[PDB]
Design a protein around this nucleic acid. Structure first.
Lengths: 133, 256, 247, 86, 84, 149
RNA sequence: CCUUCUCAAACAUUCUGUUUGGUAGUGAGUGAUACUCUUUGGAGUUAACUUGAAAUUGCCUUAAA
């Protein structure tokens, strides 16, 4: 026998936990929802999970909406075994970038450039692709 | 200037490096990279700067693709009004005179209607080599056509200054497309320091002509972006310093 | 039950709106702070769309004047975003098909540009405003009796005396001068008027008027252009002709 | 009835076609019977003008079809202009 | 508007004030005085009329505000309530 | 169904008005300029007649099929689902034939067929038939099954 | 069950040359080339290649009823 956890996928854009919450509150006061975004420049990777309260609530939602169509994706939703433990996907944003540098001085990094210039020339020389200078 | 004989021995040495030990077509094409101080941060751009050249490699590319399979070819996208105004007959009068040919002209409605179905969108465009767009539409495109076009440097769209203000004429294009075919090359601005250019092939026009074209771009660009250094590779090779600029390295902590 | 299709279109259109309006917001911030290197066009622009229709282009080059402006519904998926909702609620345009006058300037020319898709825009005529203010106009009175928070019709220039005699104003055609001629700072009127609550153009839902509703919506699709482009022209129409319908 | 059929179906083009394809009514025989014609008509104009000039100052709203109102306005000022110039 | 085109009088009330020209204020109610001056031949000019587009024009002037300011020294003025 | 009709009403047919209008146009163009019946484009719309539709089947050309349930001599159409099953063709039963009368300009038709569609809707159709295949191949595959026990 | 930033200037006229600016992407992965930073934390930039929009886990109110 299955669990109240449900796995939905094949989602469109513009369909976020805001939408899932106000929609599936029609079916039940939810235990929990989670959505799949990318972690970097966070946008939807088009799937998610939920538990409403009950196994029966999950069953009827899946039965109702298994092959449901929308704007021109269609969702596929499935009922899961006992447990099966949504465990991850802290909701990730598009992060603010921060600049930790340049601490090391112009003189030292220029000497780094001077020595690794020659390092580059010798590694291409030993590849072997000879190069003067 | 850079030693042209360093360029010449570079091309012959990578010729032997490539001669003996899809895949070879990936390997053999030349890339030239520039490091600079910094590009524009916190401003994500997709524009292209059309750097003038004296000799185009697109005629070698077209002569190569007549035999080859990727079918080097062009696409055009335009405002809604001009499709009834323009046709292929005019450019077939004009551009075969020089010996080039435009494949197709498209409208934005066509673009959003039939080259939706993202698989089919990609599949429609992927055969095309050179993508060209309206000076008005260029900002609106990526909501429509998407970043799979923009990731590949060949497939990244380019404007053209079309509207002779006012009462746009075709002749304004039938010279301008000749200019950008024979005499200009578009180049991208990323974030950061690093910038690649898919410069060309070695089966195409000679290293002697490529050397002066490389001299032209370098003399244009040493002032453009305060650039740091220049290297070359062909699609795997670790970087060869051919221009090593350190007078600009002194200013980096001067900026802060 | 709430029809997820409706939900996602709602959210998507608000996404479009939130996008373009944050664009124009920090744009107009950049115009005002005048770092004006990276802008397509540093100047404003104007489209007087009139009569299969004719289209005429200019700039403001202000030279300010008056305008008359009305809430129309639309478009059709847009839950209220905060950063417009506050400014329009100041402007008293809610409970749609409400019409108010304004005087243009440079602080406020962006405000019309944000509220633009939600609203119809154009300049009125002397006959039009005459017919409007003579046939309509509604005012609260408070004083000396009768607390009575009732919107009460204009009958009385003694009310104009006792409420606007500080401005030296009686004889409501003087208000018409204040509006028409952009008179002495005009905010007495613009705070006072309780501006016009207009009539639904075609009520209906009989069959014959369903047709007319659809014609109305088609004409609106023809005549409205939501370019959303953040350099776009401001739209202007024949409100003189249109209030012949709506008044 | 035909229009509602066209709207519960579609073919709104033919609906518009059907709207254009009717003949609204006239009342000339009604007039010519009820007042024969001229001196009795001008005897009984007064109650018309009262309602007319009332409605032309009456404002537009629901239950009006304000086409009627601007029609009343123009026919009113036609009367005013004639009788003024005379 | 609604100009008439062709193709003894009301004795005396027609053509009273013949060859009169009244510069009428905007403050006064026009929509009835204009019917009468059209009845009895006279021209009107309102000041709002010219907003969009030597002893010539000022023959008569219509103002019925109780108080008026700033009155100037060049006022060859009557008030129109006599005419009313 | 709602999606289906959002689709189909785009590919609604030609009415008489548009036909005579088209005819007057191509009468204008046939004489002086051109016609190979190219003065007008290829039209693309529903194929709706029963005999013609079922003739198109076994050629076979129909991308999708719509079958009314409520036809009174039901023997007209009882064979059809088997037929499109056996030929492997995208059929589905609909609720009410008057709908089809809407979309091809009749009181009713009892069958609607698609064989040709412009390119923009190809994947839309593709997902559509995928949906109904996901409604028939798994849960109304059992239309003969479910004897009680 | 919405439907997309469709163009502006400078000049001199070119029956258009030059310059300026103007986009923040469907996601998923595939393998794998180079440059910055600072400490490994890889943060940001770098060849092209698949996928039916695919997919299971990276602290306002008349647009009513």
């Amino acid at each position: 026998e299955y669990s109240g956890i449900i796995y939905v996928s094949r989602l469109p854009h513009g369909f976020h936990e805001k939408e899932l919450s106000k929609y599936f509150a029609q079916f039940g006061d939810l235990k929990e929802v989670r959505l799949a975004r990318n972690k970097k420049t966070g946008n939807s990777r088009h799937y998610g999970f939920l538990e409403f309260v009950n196994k029966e609530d999950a069953m009827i939602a899946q039965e109702s909406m298994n092959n449901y169509l929308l704007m021109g994706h269609l969702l596929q939703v499935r009922v899961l075994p006992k447990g099966a433990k949504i465990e991850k996907l802290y909701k990730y944003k598009k992060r603010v970038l921060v600049e930790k540098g340049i601490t090391k001085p112009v003189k030292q990094l220029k000497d780094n450039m001077k020595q690794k210039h020659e390092e580059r020339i010798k590694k291409l020389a030993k590849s072997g692709i000879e190069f003067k200078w | 200037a850079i030693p042209r004989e360093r360029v010449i021995k570079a091309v012959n040495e990578l010729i032997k490096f490539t001669s003996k030990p899809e895949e070879e077509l990936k390997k053999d094409l030349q890339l030239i990279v520039v490091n600079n101080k910094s590009f524009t941060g916190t401003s994500k751009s997709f524009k292209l700067k059309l750097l003038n050249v004296k000799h185009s490699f697109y005629k070698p590319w077209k002569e190569a693709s007549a035999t080859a399979v990727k079918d080097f070819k062009v696409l055009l996208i335009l405002k809604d009004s001009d499709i009834k105004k323009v046709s292929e007959d005019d450019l077939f009068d004009q551009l075969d005179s020089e010996g080039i040919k435009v494949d197709e002209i498209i409208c934005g409605k066509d673009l959003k209607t039939v080259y939706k179905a993202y698989e089919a969108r990609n599949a429609f465009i992927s055969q095309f080599s050179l993508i060209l767009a309206d000076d008005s539409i260029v900002t609106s495109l990526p909501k429509l056509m998407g970043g799979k076009a923009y990731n590949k440097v060949e497939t990244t769209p380019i404007s053209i200054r079309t509207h002779a203000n006012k009462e746009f004429s075709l002749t304004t294009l039938t010279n301008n497309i000749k200019k950008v075919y024979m005499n200009q090359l578009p180049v991208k601005l990323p974030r950061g320091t690093t910038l690649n250019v898919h410069l060309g092939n070695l089966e195409w026009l000679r290293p002697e002509e490529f050397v002066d074209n490389v001299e032209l771009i370098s003399e244009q660009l040493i002032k453009a972006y305060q650039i740091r250094s220049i290297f070359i590779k062909t699609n795997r090779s670790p970087v060869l310093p051919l221009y090593y600029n350190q007078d600009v390295l002194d200013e980096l902590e001067a900026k802060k | 039950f709430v029809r997820a299709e409706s939900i996602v279109a709602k959210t998507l259109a608000t996404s479009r709106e939130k996008e373009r309006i944050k664009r124009v917001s920090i744009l107009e911030d950049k115009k005002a702070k005048n770092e004006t290197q990276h802008i397509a066009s540093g100047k404003d622009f104007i489209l007087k769309i009139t009569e299969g229709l004719i289209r005429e282009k200019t700039t403001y080059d202000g030279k300010p004047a008056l305008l008359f402006i009305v809430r129309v519904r639309g478009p059709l998926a847009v839950n209220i975003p905060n950063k417009a909702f506050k400014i329009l609620s100041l402007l008293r345009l809610v409970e749609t098909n409400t019409g108010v006058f304004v005087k243009l300037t440079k602080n406020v020319y962006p405000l019309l540009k944000v509220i633009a898709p939600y609203v119809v825009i154009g300049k009125p005529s002397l006959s039009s405003i005459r017919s409007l203010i003579q046939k309509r106009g509604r005012i609260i009175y408070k004083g000396e009796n009768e607390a009575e928070p009732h919107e009460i019709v204009l009958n009385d220039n003694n009310i104009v005396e006792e409420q606007l005699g500080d401005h030296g104003i009686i004889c409501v055609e003087d208000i018409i001068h204040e509006i028409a001629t952009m008179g002495e700072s005009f905010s007495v009127c613009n705070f006072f008027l309780q501006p016009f609550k207009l009539n639904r153009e075609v009520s209906g839902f009989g069959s014959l008027n369903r047709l007319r509703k659809i014609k109305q919506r088609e004409a609106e699709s023809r005549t409205r252009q939501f370019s959303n482009a953040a350099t776009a022209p401001v739209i202007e129409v024949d409100i003189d002709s249109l209030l012949a319908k709506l008044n | 009835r035909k229009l509602t059929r066209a709207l519960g179906r579609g073919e709104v083009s033919s609906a518009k076609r059907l709207e254009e394809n009717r003949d609204s009514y006239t009342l000339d025989h009604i007039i010519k019977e009820r007042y024969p014609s001229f001196p009795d008509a001008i005897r009984d104009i007064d109650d018309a003008l009262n309602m007319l000039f009332l409605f032309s100052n009456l404002p537009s709203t629901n239950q009006v079809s304000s086409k009627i109102i601007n029609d009343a306005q123009k026919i009113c000022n036609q009367w005013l202009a004639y009788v003024a110039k005379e | 508007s609604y100009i008439l085109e062709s193709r003894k009088y009301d004795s005396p009330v027609a053509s009273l004030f013949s060859a009169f020209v009244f510069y009428v204020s905007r403050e006064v109610p026009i929509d009835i005085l204009e019917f009468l001056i059209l009845s009895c031949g006279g021209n009107v000019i309102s000041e709002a009329a010219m907003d969009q587009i030597d002893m010539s024009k000022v023959t008569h002037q219509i103002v019925d505000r109780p108080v008026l300011k700033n009155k100037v020294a060049g006022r060859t003025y009557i008030q129109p309530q006599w005419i009313f | 169904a709602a999606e289906t009709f959002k689709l189909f009403n785009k590919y609604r047919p030609e009415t008489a008005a548009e036909k005579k209008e088209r005819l007057t146009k191509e009468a204008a163009a046939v004489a002086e300029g051109k016609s190979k019946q190219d003065a007008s484009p290829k039209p693309y719309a529903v194929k709706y007649g029963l005999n013609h539709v079922v003739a198109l089947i076994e050629n076979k050309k129909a991308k999708l099929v719509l079958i009314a349930n409520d036809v009174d001599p039901i023997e007209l159409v009882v064979f059809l689902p088997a037929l499109c099953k056996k030929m492997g063709v995208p059929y589905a039963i609909v609720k009410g034939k008057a709908r089809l009368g809407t979309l091809v300009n009749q009181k009713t038709s009892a069958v609607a067929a698609l064989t040709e569609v412009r390119a923009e809707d190809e994947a839309a159709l593709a997902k559509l038939v995928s949906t109904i295949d996901a409604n028939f191949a798994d849960k109304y595959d059992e239309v003969k099954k479910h004897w009680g026990g």
